[PDB]
Structure formats: C-alpha cells, structure tokens
Amino acid sequence: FFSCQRGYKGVWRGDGIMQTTCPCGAQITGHVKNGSMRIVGPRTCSNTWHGTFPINAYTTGPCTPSPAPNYSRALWRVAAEEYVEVTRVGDFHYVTGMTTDNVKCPCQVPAPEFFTEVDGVRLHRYAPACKPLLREEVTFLVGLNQYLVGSQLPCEPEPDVAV
C-alpha cells in the first residue's frame, strides 16, 4: 500500500468517537474525552505509534480539530481549487505563496481549524490537490488592492520597530 499519512495530535473540540482510514489501509479509532484523543489502531500503522489521527475524506465523527496558534506555516484554501501559503512570524502572518498568481484573499487569517493544512498535517476532510506554490514575483488580491508575495495580511497592525 501507500505510506502512512502524517496524522494530527492535539486538542479536539467536542467529545465522541472519531473514525478514519490511513493511506496504508489501516482503520484508526480515536476516542475523545475532555479534549484528548486516545488512539486505537494496528501496530502496522505509523499513526498508531505516534498516537496521531490522519484526517481524510474517510474521516468520520462529531469532534473537531483545534490546532495551537503557534504553527510555522499553513495551507489556506481561498477558492475551490486554489491555495495560499501562510507563514507565521510571532503575532503576524504573511502570504508567502499561492497556487495561482493574483488570487483573491481575505485580509485576516482565520482560526487554525480553518486551514486545510498546518505544518504538514491535514485538518480537513475535503482537500483538493495543491498545485506548485508560487513564492516570487506574483501577487494576491485583498479586495481591490494588490500585494506582492511575502506581504503580511492588510488588516494586521504592523510590527513596531521595538527590538
């Protein structure tokens, strides 16, 4: 079969029993109580050993992923098949990449749970493949304004010169 999917491990919102299937074919069960998920799976799957849960189109359950705000990068789906990469520096966020040049984009990042992917871990059951990320000489649209790649999001207060 295929290699195992890099699973998610962190706080979950709402309790219950989560179900999913890893690309290696293994079925993984996550019992969520008080925000913590206990993993049950085959010794054959990597997620079992890491105590992680691979979120797929195969994932089932009532609980929701609740990622920590201190990620490095995230994949943000700003259209049905288009993404933008969000790089985090301290309290600020910068659009460091885009699947297409001139993609429209919101002026504020959402909560981590709204990202399709965070530091390599998928969080959504629905995720279109991600075309190559364009990180230079391209721009994104926030309303009617244009911003060169690498620009922090428009509605974010600029970092003062305190160092």
Q: Point out the annotated binding site for Zn(2+).
A: 4, 22, 24, 45
> Is residue 4 part of the contact set for Zn ion (CB under 5 A)?
yes
Question: Dihedrals φ, ψ of 88, to 5°?
Answer: -100, 130
By the rule CB under 5 A, 24 interacts with Zn ion: yes
User: For residues 49 and 155, which CB has a smaller minimum distance to a second copy in the complex?
Assistant: 49
Query: Partners of 142 in the beta sheet?
Result: 145
Give the residues lining the site for a second copy (CB under 8 A).
1-5, 23-24, 44-46, 49-50, 56-58, 122, 126-127, 129-132
The contact mask relative to Zn ion for 32-71 (x = CB under 5 A, - = no) is -------------x--------------------------
Of 46 and 151, nearer to Zn ion (C-beta) is 46
Supply the minimum distance, in Å, between the C-beta of residue 65 and a second copy.
15
Is-contact 34 66, C-beta < 8 A? no
Q: Which two tokens stand for residue 62?
A: 């009532």
Residue pointed to by tokens 């890491």:
50
Coil, strand or helix at 48? helix
How many angstroms separate the first and last alpha carbons of the chain? Answer: 51
Closest separation between CB of residue 162 and Zn ion, Å? 43
Q: Which is nearer to a second copy, 77 or 122 (CB)?
A: 122
CA atoms of 143 and 145, how far apart (whole Å): 6
Which residues contact residue 129 at a Cβ distance below 8 angstroms, ignoring those fewer than 6 apart? none
Binding site for Zn ion (CB under 5 A): 4, 22, 24, 26, 45
